[PDB]
Amino acid sequence: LGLASANVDFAFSLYKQLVLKAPDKNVIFSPLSISTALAFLSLGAHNTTLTEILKGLKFNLTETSEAEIHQSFQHLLRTLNQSSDELQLSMGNAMFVKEQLSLLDRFTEDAKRLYGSEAFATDFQDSAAAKKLINDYVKNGTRGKITDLIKDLDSQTMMVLVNYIFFKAKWEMPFDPQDTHQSRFYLSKKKWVMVPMMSLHHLTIPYFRDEELSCTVVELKYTGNASALFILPDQDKMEEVEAMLLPETLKRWRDSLEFREIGELYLPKFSISRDYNLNDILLQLGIEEAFTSKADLSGITGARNLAVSQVVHKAVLDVFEEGTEASTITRFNRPFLMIIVPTDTQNIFFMSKVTNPKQA
């Protein structure tokens, strides 16, 4: 019910941190992949480590317990994977483990039941096979390295948790390549660059002019249960609009969207790919013990011998005339936001800021 709110709350909290690290760069990430990866990790955690992770994910433990959160993610995973051929949406989970490392049955069975995860015998003693075998399997997703706390000599990798997402879809109203023109994109009020600009003419789509936050929201739907929300702040009002990115503002926009006969729409063709280390960012959002000697991941092995060495996230989005792919004149010729979102939920599959499409 209000567990998607936690996921959205988390999405925008994380986005703001990503933005502080690179003020004027393109942003692209799957917040759901991170939430599901962290929830998946929390299956093996206890006490303060478990508490920091759930609270960090923006769940309120006053109204929803641990089991209900894991059931929520289990139910969500079934609703994405299955099934419609017209739009290819899927999210999986996996864990690469050291061979002799023995796990608790509880953990592996819950990992299988709740998250569909399965162990793969892996040798981490060479970084060639280890880091390559994983990157094939994961193109868009997030990975959590677990390390031995604990051993005297070295801090060796014991386990890697993984959550991937895949998204390939076509527009309900696709752009005609014949109408794609090179055109101005303003990086700042004075400074611009030539970009491939797609356009649609005389179409009717959900629209909402938000006068208070000085931004225009438009919804371009895909065939299937998903849609791209594009938000266009007025010049110099991007930072103000980012400040207002909250669960309440996203719900409002979507409820406020009403069909309007647009004369001309211009959206740039763009392809953003970003790689993030999330250690510092997760630390700021109140997940600290898991990266410490004080970490309690005894739910994995049975002893407090495991700690999170690192959490990374890689995402790639292509927006083009035919559709989107994870590898009144409304004109998007200045920095904008794209939020990809399912039809019947508040969750966020992907989110991005496009500052310069000739970049990333």
DSSP state for residue 236 in the 8-state scheme: T
Peptide bond preceding 83 in cis form (omega within 30 of 0) = yes
**What residues does CATH 2.30.39.10 cover in the chain?**
171-267+327-357
Residue 25, class by beta-carbon neighbours within 10 Å (0-12 exposed, 13-18 middle, 19+ buried)?
A: middle
Instruction: Give me the CATH code for the 1-170+268-321 domain, please.
Output: 3.30.497.10
Which residues belong to CATH 3.30.497.10 in the chain? 1-170+268-321
The CA radius of gyration of the chain, in Å to the nearest whole number, is 21
**Token pair of 146, please?**
């677990």
250, two tokens:
């996203």
Tokens at 310, concatenated: 């690192």
* Distance between CA atoms of residues 291 and 296, nearest Å: 10
What is the SS3 assignment for 210? strand
Q: How were these coordinates obtained?
A: X-ray
Alpha-carbon span 17 to 284, nearest angstrom: 9
Instruction: Report the alpha-carbon distance of residue 200 to residue 205 in Å, rounded.
Output: 11
CATH (residue range 171-267+327-357)? 2.30.39.10
Name the token pair of 16.
């703001």
Helices within the chain (DSSP H only): 3-21, 31-42, 47-56, 66-81, 105-115, 127-137, 238-243, 247-256, 279-284, 298-301
Which two structure tokens, joined as six digits, stand for 236? Answer: 């110099």
Question: Is the Cα dihedral 134, 135, 138, 144 positive or negative?
Answer: positive
- What the block records as the tokens of 231 is 């938000």
Please, which residues bridge with residue 21 across strands?
none
| Cβ count near 223 (within 10 Å) | 14
